[PDB]
Ligand binder design. Structure first.
Ligand SMILES: CO[C@@H]1[C@@H](OC(N)=O)[C@@H](O)[C@H](Oc2ccc3c(O)c(NC(=O)c4ccc(O)c(CC=C(C)C)c4)c(=O)oc3c2C)OC1(C)C
Ligand SMILES: CO[C@@H]1[C@@H](OC(N)=O)[C@@H](O)[C@H](Oc2ccc3c(O)c(NC(=O)c4ccc(O)c(CC=C(C)C)c4)c(=O)oc3c2C)OC1(C)C
Lengths: 384, 384
């Protein structure tokens, strides 16, 4: 009643162990992974454009502006690097270091997990003047690497096309809505990165590009809401090995929304970077306020929830060796991320507040009126 | 340049991909995994007592009185079964379907990841009248399996002793509090299971056992507050392949706490079981009220969030093939769980109210107070 599953065999034996489930969520994790492989080329500074296309046959194509996955032979394995990448469960090396990378995702490079769980996979590489092609199916090579033609231009890059295996996912098909949502997210987290979504079926096409990045992301969060000031603030900075990006904006409403990210993956339960943000923001507001005489009688302006009212913000950090609560996602634990965020946002917020006095007053003013409202509801509720 | 990592080599090459990080959380996941292996025997019905002892040298011993990991040879590999389970990255088969299992552990069986990340591991098996022993170090056999004597009093079971690899975690050491916390949780989730913690480093002892299960869990969740009744309700039932257990109590206070679990692991982001719980509870509560004539007309209408004030409950389900939203689990997606919790809870709850009309209307009126209190705070705030 027992056997050893070697390599990709294990992935097909227990798919849920690699993608959580075999439903709609798991189906799209394949898309996210291949997309993140492309996004990693952008993070490294080689890709500037990424195309995601839903083909009429249900398959999905992800093409990048990158270097193109290497096709030269790996001595130890006696096979092209691109073949090894998509056929071995876990491959690594120093190539994992030297640039920020998307965190979480599928086992190892993740690409081979997608291949194992796909009826067919086609990898095309434009590199060193040629257009290469290798085809797989459920983890195995069906068509060995070969040159199918010459590369145009100075065109280099990788184009991956795959179709999740119906033997595992049933009649599931890609959902344009979900694909667009992740593309919209990425464009925001990698400002300047152009991502195009093509849905051949409906002949639709949308471009996702935003130089404003996270600041724009913050405004996007307050879509149907009256803004306190139409221009969202952007805080950029680097501390140690951590790149920090924070964007925020206020609305005259009373709802809030703070999204946090670590290496391009949502961190629902926050972590060191989120706690460092709330803290730094609080430090800055209060400090500035006193200096400028915005506080009278020493009212209860803080209390955290008061400052959160009508606050829309996005905190994003990038760091090597990220540490998560468990299973590479959820809550960021790196203390250095906390120090980076706190450091970068505190100093910069002070400046932003000083050069934008009116706005600073309105937001601090809103915090006081929020505290009072809290007080009134408390007594009222503690009356009956 | 590229390196293919075969088997356990990949675990030591990149531990965070298997345990999330190499700090305190990752360290304890090793403990959680070995404990889960023992608990699986209890879930299968062959184990009643698990001992967890923190040794003075930092190693952790986990002993269960279950069947004992088999030691016969696996012809396909030419090694005893115990060896295979602890030294191969992924082994599986029909044994995975024997019964309910703890979900979301470490890769595959999980034990081999622990072994790979420990400077040493000793596995003792009491089976078929004999006491077997086999030792490992960083994923590899150091002392092959051998019989070291008779099984004392013919007992059967597995005793695992291991020490997380200092080269991976530095000077970190198991935290008794984290251990007791998980042991307490498990005692509640598997009512009747007895777990003993011996903290030799502090000469301590402690028993975790509670036939009250999830009901007691709800009670202890509300420790500190005055209850509306000190006897927790217990709803248990099986619908399809899903076993459900829900416990709940009410306090005179205003705070609330609802914990959910799927196959022994916390689902902080809810899922089908949670949604179904509140719907079944809400339907049974509002229907009973109408039936017994409690829905007055001279006031506000009780809604969600109103009937969950001062309500402490724990919703726990066990089912085969759990489906989560990939990630770090977080949300249960199986529609069968929802129908299971709904069916089982709704009906049983209906009888609870009819059998406790006193408490029944005491709960409804409490929802009424919360309704007005909620609208009193609204008025107050809109008044600013
Ligand atoms: C799924 O494959 C991904 C890539 O995905 C995409 N879409 O381009 C990308 O995320 C990243 O791609 C890399 C990662 C590292 C190098 C990299 O180190 C290069 N540098 C070299 O000089 C080089 C040249 C030839 C060669 O055989 C190797 C080692 C082989 C590798 C990295 C597969 C390296 C290079 O030219 O391309 C690279 C590329 C395209 O990592 C992979 C391979 C897992
Ligand atoms: C890390 O080991 C764990 C176990 O932990 C402990 N402490 O018991 C436990 O969680 C579960 O333990 C099982 C799981 C299934 C069977 C099981 O199916 C049994 N039934 C047999 O008749 C049997 C007899 C000989 C044999 O080689 C095998 C299959 C081999 C196995 C389960 C490793 C099965 C049995 O005797 O013991 C079993 C045991 C002890 O699964 C493991 C092996 C991954």
């Amino acid at each position: 009643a027992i056997r050893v599953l070697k390599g990709l065999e294990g992935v097909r034996h227990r798919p849920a162990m690699y993608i959580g489930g075999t439903g709609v969520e798991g189906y799209h994790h394949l898309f996210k992974e291949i997309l993140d492989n492309a996004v990693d080329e952008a993070l490294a500074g080689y890709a500037t454009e990424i195309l995601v296309r839903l083909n009429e046959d249900g398959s999905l194509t992800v093409e990048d502006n990158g270097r193109g996955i290497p096709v030269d032979l790996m001595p130890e394995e006696g096979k092209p690097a691109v073949e090894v990448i998509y056929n071995t469960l876990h491959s690594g090396g120093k190539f994992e270091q030297g640039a920020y990378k998307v965190s979480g995702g599928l086992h190892g490079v993740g690409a081979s997990v997608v291949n194992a769980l796909s009826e067919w996979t086609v990898v095309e590489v434009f590199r060193e003047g040629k257009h290469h092609r290798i085809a797989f199916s459920r983890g195995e090579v069906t068509e060995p690497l070969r040159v199918v033609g010459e590369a145009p231009r100075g065109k280099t890059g990788t184009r991956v096309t795959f179709k999740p295996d119906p033997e595992i996912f049933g009649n599931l098909r890609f959902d344009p809505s979900k694909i667009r949502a992740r593309l919209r997210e990425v464009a925001y987290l990698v400002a300047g990165l152009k991502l195009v979504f093509q849905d051949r079926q409906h002949g639709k096409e949308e471009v996702f590009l935003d130089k404003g990045g996270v600041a724009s992301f913050a405004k996007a969060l307050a879509e149907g809401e009256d803004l306190l000031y139409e221009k969202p603030f952007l805080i950029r900075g680097t501390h140690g090995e951590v790149e920090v990006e924070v964007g925020f904006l206020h609305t005259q409403g009373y709802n809030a929304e703070i999204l946090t990210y670590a290496n391009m993956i949502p961190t629902r339960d926050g972590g060191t970077h989120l706690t460092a943000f709330k803290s730094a923001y609080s430090r800055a507001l209060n400090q500035y306020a006193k200096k400028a005489g915005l506080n009278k009688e020493k009212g209860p302006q803080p209390t955290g929830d008061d400052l959160l009212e009508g606050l829309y913000a996005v905190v994003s950090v990038k760091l090597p060796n990220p540490q998560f609560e468990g299973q590479t996602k959820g809550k960021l634990l790196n203390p250095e991320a906390g120090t980076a965020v706190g450091q970068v946002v505190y100093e910069r917020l002070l400046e932003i507040l000083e050069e934008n006095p009116r706005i600073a007053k309105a937001v601090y003013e809103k915090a006081l009126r929020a505290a009072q409202a809290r007080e009134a509801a408390r007594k009222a509720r503690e009356l009956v």
